[PDB]
Amino acid sequence: RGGRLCYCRGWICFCVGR
């Protein structure tokens, strides 16, 4: 899982941390 996952999809990018 790493820790924080940032997903960028086009002109919007969100990132979630656990």
Curated annotation (Swiss-Prot):
Annotated S-S bridges: C6-C15, C8-C13
Family recorded in the similarity comment: Belongs to the cathelicidin family.
Modified residues (Arginine amide): R18
Stated role: Microbicidal activity.
Gene, per the UniProt record: NPG4
Superkingdom of the source species: Eukaryota
Protein name: Protegrin-4
Protein's cellular compartments: Secreted
